[PDB]
Design a protein around this ligand. Structure first.
Ligand SMILES: *[C@@](C)(CO)[C@](*)(O)[C@H](Cc1ccccc1)NC(=O)[C@H](Cc1ccc(OC)cc1)NC(=O)[C@H](C)NC(=O)CN1CCOCC1
Ligand SMILES: [Mg+2]
Lengths: 240, 235, 233, 211, 195, 244, 231, 222
């Protein structure tokens, strides 16, 4: 078998293949995660260089791993399918051997472990993907939002963004998101998520996708018109 | 290119030496061993204020009598910890007893040089393994990716290590109490950290014979920080 | 799992004051057929050990080759092969015992019963048994098959316990072994008159005697025996 | 063997005998048929002693690893399932094990029956071993959810006594346990010889026996 | 385990499964649910060798739930039954076959039709208006042959099912401790708590 | 040892791109243009054969359009040999699905499977990727008529109208201009041929330089028919639309 | 230069640079001394610490009741090789009821190290070993190099500044070989030998490590206050 | 058909004192009606103040002892010459036996020594690895003959105090090493009389804090 060590240390103590995988994430479309008091919202950029697209059948950016957990990403699209598939298999495997669904923290830890394994295994390259994993643990009303990256490190975030121009939207979130008082309702949480994407997106038309996840496996994706109403209200307040 | 298990003209493994450079970039971790227990403390170093700092888990339980702190590429440490925990519990299954701290450390270090063309590269993380057993008492070990481990009375690893190690050189003596050690770790962490030390960006832990391995609450650490500030202002 | 085809019967042995004696007949039976009359079942290893084998002859020939190969292998990179690092009876036995037990554990045994007789470096007598099951034991007298039932009782009259060994001379021990071989020829239906005998002494070394015969046999009383009860003529 | 275990208002009772046989020969008068897996988890043993000890002690390893990985105690449901999955690997190979996994977790008190076939059953009351039929008789007629800790301990103790008397392959002594939300509590070793005579006099039962 | 019945009526599928579990000469449980929900509109009941039944059922359940998540779509009862049959037909020539018989009751939301599939441990699949495994059919099929109509209501299906259980309780030597009944229709799966 | 000669086909550039995927895409850009257009009542597949000869046997030839099953077809752009390896795998997957579930495979599931195979060659194994881009035209009862594309990266996307191969930039602009949602198959046929006629590097677009196919519910009642156009039938539709 | 990228490449002068670089790792290692008489064999090792808070890295490893070694270079490689020796010593005992000859132990180490020098992908061992033992032919001392070369000697030393101790033993050859039936005097000669390799630092209680094996003496290691007698 | 198992007879006995422990066994080795050896040692000093005897099929018994002795050696290597406690040895042996759950070591095993508090300890094993700490245990051919005698004369079972008539038990007073050895010798002398596989000799290994001591006694040779 092909055993060649592709991810190796350089004289300055860097693993370039892992760092170049982060550059693939930088190229990917922007993804954002914001957790409110009783919900989590996942926002995703859709680049409008591709029109004549069939939005019914085109792979959506946010993927359900189980009925109570979702996963969005930034980076190589093909790579993300492999992580999602593995995550979905592990979710059913956990339910089967332990009789409880996975915690969001556990699912994150697994996906991050898969990414890490691909940084010190022979013959393979790292995943060019960073993920945002969100949801609610079984019989728990506390929101969960985690981030992973090609190196395999993971952590919990009150709010986070990844992908292209993520530096700008993180700047926005850092000054706009208050920890002492997070978005109390779904509306406030979605509004803050759309606002953050409008710093980067371009047009607020079909370029913004929003997915709201509430406790007890209550997950819904907003439509174009519903999002467009947020886009309208934000700019009308801005004209002042 | 060149082999992964290649020797340099000086007689060192290139990859092992390069992994040591990655560990120098890691966040600071300090360990101090006393006759009343071993203290382990780390710099959390959150990359952003929105990152929930309590999810940063750089101090970890291996067994009830063994704890572990890490510095460097912390993702690499997960499989090491998993092996450590398995080794510790498996020995308890085979021998109906706690495993020696040295034997546990040796088992972890046996993974280190299992790389080639087994895993494709050495680990990019160093570990401070602290614990207690009946034979050799309170112990602190430093486990490197070279497969070597040294026992230490006190040790610092990470970006502020040589500055911290010089400080530990002067401060450590064989009659330190647990409380004195706690304040000493906090003092040296505060010295080498970029940001101002508080209960949210730094974490303490200890291992004692009675209570075993315990990670300190943020409320408990906050009091020890306030106790430190007052005793430094006392002269 | 197999069945033994061509077989060798009893191997008998005993300790005496300065060494050990071992003997076995020269027959290779094929069931009730006395097929092969020139089979050597005592196999010397160096000048300090003799291995006596009973049971399946094809498996015996296999063991004979392992031992021959063992000597070759021991001499490799060994300047003291004919001195301090020569093969000892205890080494040769433990090797065979390891092989026998491994083979039974794979359910494919060497269908044999083996007695290793020899003298160690320090002059101590060595005598130990091992069989197809990997079962091992030591005694002042040892015998396989029929020998265990008929020979041991006769040999144990000479050396009944450990303290009787220094009191037993080589002449007495050989006499007892030779008598036992005669008794086995009288009573074992798969035995032969011709046999081999080996003496391993700590002073006089290895003496290997071939083409021995059972002699001084009593048959004359047969002429008087008539019928099975009431018959007079 | 006779073993039993049942849930009630104040947790779960666990009572076992201590006899071990090798045919008609009583090989052991006092064998521990309960395993302490963790302060909140117990396991009973019936069938092949070696199989029971090995696999349940291996379950404890796996339950312990669960705590280290997740920083939290394993559920009774998950522990029982891990054990059942082990039995399922050695499917048809000839293992003989019948055990009840008793404990307290976030759902409250938990009790699962698990055997060599891989069967895994949740329930209020179980009894395993050669003398289970005798134990069930006493349990079914006297069991309530509203039992006091004192009366519940006696029921399990009395139920084992019933089996030890009639079943030739049950006896020796009675080991009692009581599982609470603060963990399990050992309630001693009780010799059946002494216990029988005591119960006979105090209760008035076993009238047909002379003493 | 012992008795599992199934009946497909006008607008639903009804599955009835015994509650008893026996080890040796003792009945360990009299409230056992011999069924698994594979999807919101698909239910599978099972009977066979101890242990194998639940493992197989749970293994199927996991596979169908995995499919549902991957495609964000519910497989038709027909598609699920074919998947199950293949797994059993694969199993029968294995080193150690899974000795499990199943009934699959599902409501096809596309066709707006209830569907009942009977599959034995060999992988023998048949779509039926009513079905059973083991000896259950010997006692019950004569009643079903007589009383069954395809335009029956769910309530009429339950009454006919009661008659089948009563006949089983009269003429079977074994005490199966009654049955748990579940209904599968357009609105999903629900359990009849009084039977 | 052998390391010396390893090109390392599965690595990132400093910019975070996969070298071999990018170079494979460069190869595909020289391949004959293939176009797919989805209408309300069917799908059109049109593709240009590369500089042919008069002595090529066209009626028995197939380099662009392939049948995966009765409901799904593909247009190829890139190395034909590479494409046939993948096509045969896709045909097998469709039959495996049919055997397992007793239902025809949904279009996206087949597309995802092939795209996942392509992805594997970019992440592990040390082999070169497949130098192929597909346009998938198919029908199932969930989403109806569907167009997809996949490329050597293993990434796939859904489309109303799309082109692969040469001059896709020009071709996509022309399709984006004239395409409308209420369009029908006969109109889509005309759009596809007109787009090829303007983007082609050849002097003129003729029947012998084209492969053409439609997927229509224009089959007697609720069912779907695949039509791989014969040389004479391509010649007729060229006259009908007014190109020759 | 161009021929030191891997172990599978000879240089134009017939040299194996990767092996030579592995040999260099031994020279960086701390000094250790080996010597023997006709009755006993002794190892003396200068242990090295990381700093004042750290412990002193152990240098001596036991392989059997009658055999053991001291290391200089990569300590993990010594663990791998000593583990192999333990197994081979043990295979000899279990199968042949025979204590493994020291000379044969050297031959086994040689052959194990050699395979790493001729194959692609692997690397040579980065450690030197001094094996002492007492077998049926008396006391023995071996020197192991990771090139594969194993040498039987009366006395030797390896590590940094080992040339000083080696010269001393070369002078003392006729004296220490005759030290029969006196373990303490043989150790003294070893401690005096290793002292010729010291600079700046001297032999302290947690610095010094000594091992001995002999006629009626199992392989035993002395550390801590057990070696204060010899300081 | 090949039968990989055999029966070499023999009988063993382990008794735990207050600060000592004994492990005794006869020295007779047999097959069917033949005597193989009148003196074939069966109880072994395994190091770390532990003694062990594997009774039943001698080939499996020798193999197990050999492997445990080896396990002790590697326990020293791997854990800095730490002493293997009797409870740790017992658990280790369980795993040695269960390695062959499906092709067992056909032996009943007993080990003896001192626990970590200095008190006497005996552990008992079945062929597949079930074990338990005990005060008194006989194993092998004549186990059924000896155990009832020990229940009576060591644990004072069915013995009550005169005058009370069954109301007050005989108090469980501790036994000395000299008293235990008397019960051991009488156990084997009685077993020799009524069991054909028991005889020839008796070898006892006594374990104290001072070490492991041996005692040998002749038995009837018929
Ligand atoms: C009662 C006493 C039924 O006899 C219990 O089920 C009891 C349960 C138990 C649990 C843990 C610890 C001790 C006792 N079971 C036994 O005592 C058990 C009975 C039994 C034997 C064999 C079986 O099939 C494999 C099933 C049940 N007895 C034993 O396990 C005895 C102590 N040991 C053996 O039988 C060992 N075998 C192994 C092969 O060699 C022959 C002896
Ligand atoms: Mg007798």
């Amino acid at each position: 078998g092909y055993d060649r060590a592709l991810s190796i240390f350089s004289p300055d103590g860097h693993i370039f293949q892992v760092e170049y995988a982060l550059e693939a994430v930088k190229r990917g479309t922007c993804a954002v995660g914001v957790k409110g008091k009783n919900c989590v919202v996942l926002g995703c950029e859709r680049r409008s260089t591709l029109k004549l697209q069939d939005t019914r059948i085109t792979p959506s950016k946010v993927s359900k791993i189980d009925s109570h957990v979702v996963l969005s990403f930034s980076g190589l699209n093909a790579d993300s399918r492999i992580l999602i598939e593995k995550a979905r298999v592990e979710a059913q495997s956990h339910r089967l051997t332990l009789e409880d669904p996975v915690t969001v923290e556990y699912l994150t830890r697994y996906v991050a472990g898969v990414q890490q394994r691909y940084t010190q295994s022979g013959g393979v390259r790292p995943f060019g993907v960073s993920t945002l994993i969100a949801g609610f643990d079984p019989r728990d009303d506390e929101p969960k939002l985690y981030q992973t990256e090609p190196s395999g490190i993971y952590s919990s975030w009150s709010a986070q963004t990844i992908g292209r121009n993520s530096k700008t939207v993180r700047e926005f979130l850092e000054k706009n998101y208050d920890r002492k008082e997070p978005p109390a309702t779904v509306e406030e949480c979605v509004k803050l998520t759309v606002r953050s994407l409008l710093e980067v997106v371009q047009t607020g038309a079909k370029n913004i996708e929003i997915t709201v996840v509430k406790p007890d496996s209550d997950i819904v994706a907003l439509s174009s018109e519903e999002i467009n109403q947020y886009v309208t209200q934000i700019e009308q307040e801005k004209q002042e | 290119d060149r082999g992964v298990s290649t020797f340099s003209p000086e007689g060192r493994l290139f990859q092992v030496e390069y992994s040591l450079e990655a560990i120098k970039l890691g966040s600071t971790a300090i360990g101090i061993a006393t006759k009343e227990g071993v203290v382990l403390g780390v710099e959390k170093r959150a990359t952003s204020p929105l990152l929930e700092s309590d999810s940063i888990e750089k101090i970890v339980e291996i067994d009830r009598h063994i704890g572990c702190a890490m510095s460097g590429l912390t993702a690499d440490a997960r499989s090491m910890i998993e092996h450590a925990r398995t080794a510790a519990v498996t020995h308890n299954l085979y021998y109906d007893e706690d495993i020696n701290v040295e034997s546990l450390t040796q088992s972890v270090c046996d993974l280190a040089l299992r790389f080639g063309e087994l895993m494709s590269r050495p680990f990019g993380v160093a570990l401070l393994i602290a614990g207690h057993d009946a034979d050799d008492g309170y112990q602190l070990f430093h486990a490197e990716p070279s497969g070597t481990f040294y026992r230490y009375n006190a040790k610092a690893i990470g970006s502020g290590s040589e500055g911290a190690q010089a400080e530990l050189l002067n401060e450590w003596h064989s009659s330190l109490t647990l409380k004195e050690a706690e304040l000493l770790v906090l003092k040296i962490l505060k010295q080498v950290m970029e940001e101002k030390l508080d209960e949210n960006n730094a974490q303490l832990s200890c291992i004692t014979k009675q209570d075993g391995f315990k990670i300190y609450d943020n409320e408990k650490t906050a009091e020890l920080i306030k106790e430190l500030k007052e005793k430094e202002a006392a002269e | 799992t197999q069945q033994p085809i061509v077989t060798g019967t009893s191997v008998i042995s005993m300790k005496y004051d300065n060494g050990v004696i071992i003997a076995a007949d020269n027959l290779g039976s094929y069931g009730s057929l006395l097929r092969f009359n020139g089979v050597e079942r005592l196999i010397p290893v160096g000048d300090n050990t003799v291995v006596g084998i009973s049971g399946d002859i094809s498996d015996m020939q296999h063991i004979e080759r392992l031992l021959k190969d063992l000597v070759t292998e021991n001499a490799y990179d060994n300047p003291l092969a004919d001195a301090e690092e020569a093969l000892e009876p205890s080494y040769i036995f433990e090797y065979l015992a390891t092989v026998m037990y491994q083979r039974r554990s794979k359910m494919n045994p060497l269908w044999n019963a083996i007695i290793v007789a020899g003298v160690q470096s320090n002059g101590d007598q060595f005598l130990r048994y091992v069989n197809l099951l990997g079962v091992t034991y030591s005694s002042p007298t040892l015998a396989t098959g029929f020998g265990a039932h008929m020979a041991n009782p006769l040999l144990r009259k000479v050396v009944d316990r450990e303290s009787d060994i220094p009191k037993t001379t080589v002449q007495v021990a050989e006499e007892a072994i030779v008598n036992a071989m005669r008794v086995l020829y009288y009573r074992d239906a798969r035995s032969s008159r011709n046999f081999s005998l080996a003496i391993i002494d700590k002073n006089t070394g290895l003496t290997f005697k071939k083409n021995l015969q059972v002699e001084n046999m009593k048959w004359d009383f047969a002429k008087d025996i008539k019928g099975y009860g009431t018959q007079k003529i | 063997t006779t073993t039993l275990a049942f849930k009630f208002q104040h947790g779960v009772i666990v009572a076992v005998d201590s006899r071990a046989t090798a045919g008609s020969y009583i090989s052991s008068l006092r064998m521990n048929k309960v395993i302490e897996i963790n302060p909140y988890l117990l396991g009973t043993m019936s069938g092949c002693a070696a199989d029971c000890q090995y696999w349940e002690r291996l379950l404890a390893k796996e339950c312990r690893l669960y705590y280290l990985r997740n920083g939290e105690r394993i559920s009774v449901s998950a522990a029982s399932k891990l054990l059942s999955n082990m039995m399922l690997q050695y499917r048809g190979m000839g293992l003989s094990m019948g055990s009840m996994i008793c404990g307290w977790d976030k759902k409250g008190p938990g009790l699962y029956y698990v055997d060599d076939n891989g069967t895994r059953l949740s329930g209020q009351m179980f009894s395993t071993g050669s003398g289970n039929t005798y134990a069930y008789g006493v349990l079914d007629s006297n069991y309530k959810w509203d039992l006091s800790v004192e009366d519940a301990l006696y029921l399990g103790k009395r139920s084992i006594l019933a089996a030890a008397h009639r079943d030739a392959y049950s006896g020796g002594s009675v080991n009692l346990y009581h599982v609470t939300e603060d963990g399990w509590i050992y309630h001693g070793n009780h010799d059946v010889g002494e216990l029988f005579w005591k119960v006979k006099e105090e209760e008035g039962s076993f009238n047909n026996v002379i003493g | 385990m012992d008795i599992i019945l199934g009946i497909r009526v006008q607008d639903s599928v009804i599955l009835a499964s015994s509650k008893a579990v026996t080890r040796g000469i003792s009945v360990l449980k009299d409230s056992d649910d011999k069924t698994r929900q594979l999807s919101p509109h698909t239910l599978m009941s099972f009977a066979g060798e101890a242990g194998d039944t639940v493992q197989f059922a749970e293994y199927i359940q996991a596979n169908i739930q995995l499919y549902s998540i991957r495609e964000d779509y519910e497989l038709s009862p027909q598609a699920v039954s074919s998947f199950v049959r293949q797994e059993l037909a694969k199993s029968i020539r294995s080193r150690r076959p899974y000795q499990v018989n199943v009934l699959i009751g599902g409501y096809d939301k596309k066709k707006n039709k209830p569907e009942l599939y009977q599959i034995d441990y060999l992988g023998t699949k048949v779509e039926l208006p009513y079905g059973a495994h083991g000896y259950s059919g010997f006692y019950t099929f004569s009643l079903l042959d007589h009383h069954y109509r395809p335009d029956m209501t769910t309530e009429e299906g339950l009454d006919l099912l009661k008659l089948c259980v009563q006949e089983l309780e009269k003429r079977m030597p074994m005490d199966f401790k009654g049955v748990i009944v579940k209904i599968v229709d357009k609105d999903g799966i629900r359990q009849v708590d009084d039977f | 040892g052998s390391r010396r000669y390893d090109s390392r086909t599965t690595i990132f550039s400093p910019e975070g791109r996969l070298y071999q995927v990018e170079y494979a895409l460069e190869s595909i850009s020289h391949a004959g243009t293939a176009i797919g257009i989805m209408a309300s009542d069917g799908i059109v597949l049109a593709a240009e054969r590369k500089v042919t000869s008069t002595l090529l046997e066209q009626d028995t030839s197939t380099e662009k359009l392939y049948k995966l099953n009765d409901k799904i077809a593909v247009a190829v752009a890139g190395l034909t040999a590479d494409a046939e390896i993948l096509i045969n795998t896709a045909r097998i997957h469709a039959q495996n699905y049919l055997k397992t579930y007793n239902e025809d495979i949904p279009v996206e599931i087949l597309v995802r499977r092939l795209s996942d195979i392509k992805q594997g060659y970019t992440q592990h194994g040390g082999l070169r990727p497949f130098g192929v881009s597909f346009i998938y035209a198919g029908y199932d009862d969930r989403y109806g008529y569907q167009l997809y594309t996949s490329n050597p990266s293993g990434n796939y996307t859904g489309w109303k109208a799309i082109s692969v191969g040469a001059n896709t930039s020009a071709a996509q602009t022309l399709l984006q201009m004239d395409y409308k949602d209420d369009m029908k198959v006969d109109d889509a046929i005309e759009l596809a041929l007109k787009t090829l006629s303007k983007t082609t590097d050849s002097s003129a677009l003729t029947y012998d330089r084209l492969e053409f196919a439609t997927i229509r519910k224009g089959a007697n009642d609720g069912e779907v028919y695949q039509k791989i156009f014969k040389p004479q039938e391509i010649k007729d539709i060229l006259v009908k639309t007014g190109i020759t | 230069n161009n021929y030191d990228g891997d172990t599978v490449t000879f240089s134009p002068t017939g040299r194996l640079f990767q092996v030579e670089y592995a040999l260099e790792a031994i020279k960086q290692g701390s000094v250790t001394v080996g010597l023997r008489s006709n009755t006993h064999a002794v190892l003396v090792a200068l242990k090295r610490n990381a700093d004042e808070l750290s412990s002193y890295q152990k240098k001596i490893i036991k392989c059997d009741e009658h055999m053991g070694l001291s290391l200089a270079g990569l300590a993990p490689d010594a663990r791998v090789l000593s583990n192999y020796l333990r197994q081979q010593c043990n295979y000899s005992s279990l199968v042949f009821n025979r204590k493994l000859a020291v000379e044969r132990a050297g031959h086994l180490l040689c052959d194990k190290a050699q395979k790493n020098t001729q194959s692609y992908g692997g690397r040579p061992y980065g450690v030197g070993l001094l094996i002492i033992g007492y077998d049926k032919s008396g006391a023995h001392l071996l020197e192991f190099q990771p090139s594969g070369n194993v040498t039987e000697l009366y006395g030797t030393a390896i590590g940094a500044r080992s040339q000083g101790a080696k010269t001393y033993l070369e002078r003392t050859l006729d004296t220490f070989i005759k030290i029969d039936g006196n373990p303490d005097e043989l150790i003294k000669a070893g401690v005096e030998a290793i002292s010729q390799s010291l600079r700046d630092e001297s032999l302290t209680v947690d610095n010094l490590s000594i091992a001995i094996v002999g006629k009626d003496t199992p392989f035993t290691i002395y550390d801590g206050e057990a070696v204060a007698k010899y300081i | 058909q090949f039968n990989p198992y055999g029966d070499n007879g023999g009988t063993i006995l382990g008794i735990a004192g207050e600060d000592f422990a004994v492990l005794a066994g006869d020295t007779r080795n047999i097959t069917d009606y033949s005597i193989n050896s009148r003196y074939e040692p069966k109880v072994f000093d395994c190091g770390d103040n532990i003694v062990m005897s594997a009774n039943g099929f001698a080939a499996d018994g020798d193999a197990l002892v050999k492997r445990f002795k080896n396990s002790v050696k590697w326990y020293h290597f791997d854990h800095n010459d730490k002493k293997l406690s009797i409870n740790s040895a017992a658990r280790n042996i369980q795993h040695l036996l269960y390695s062959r759950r499906f092709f067992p070591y056909y032996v009943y095993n007993i080990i003896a020594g001192l626990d970590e508090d200095g008190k006497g300890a005996v552990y008992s094993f079945d062929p597949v690895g079930s074990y338990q700490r005990e005060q008194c245990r006989a194993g092998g051919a004549a186990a059924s003959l000896i155990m009832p005698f020990l229940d009576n004369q060591v644990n004072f079972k069915n013995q009550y105090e005169p005058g009370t008539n069954g109301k007050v038990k005989k108090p469980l007073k501790y036994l000395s090493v000299e008293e235990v050895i008397k019960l051991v010798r009488d156990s084997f002398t009685s077993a020799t009389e009524r069991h054909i596989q028991v005889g020839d000799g008796l070898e006892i290994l006594i374990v104290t804090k001072d070490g492991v001591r041996k005692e040998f006694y002749e038995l009837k040779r018929d």
